[PDB]
Structures are given as structure tokens and as C-alpha cells.
Amino acid sequence: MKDPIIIESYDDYRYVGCTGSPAGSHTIMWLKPTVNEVARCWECGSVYKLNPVG
């Protein structure tokens, strides 16, 4: 929940899709960090972050 993984957004509130890793580890699933915030998986359990990017 610091800064684990980056999802390049261009919106403040956008979703993510992971499969665990670039190495295809689990299924596919969908989360949403926010510019201020973070979000956790349930399959890999990785936390993911949004960026302030415009």
C-alpha cells in the first residue's frame, strides 16, 4: 500500500486488469486504485497503485 505496481491512468480514479504478473500466473480480474489511493487483488493478492499522470 505504499507504491507496489503502477497503473498508468490519465483519469484520477481508473480501473486495472492483472493476471498476477506479466508471467500469467492466475486468471484475469479487475480492481481500481485512485490517484490518492491503492487497491489489492484477491487472486495474486498484489496491491496496485494509480498515478497523478495527465
Ligand SMILES: [Zn+2]
Ligand atoms: Zn491479480
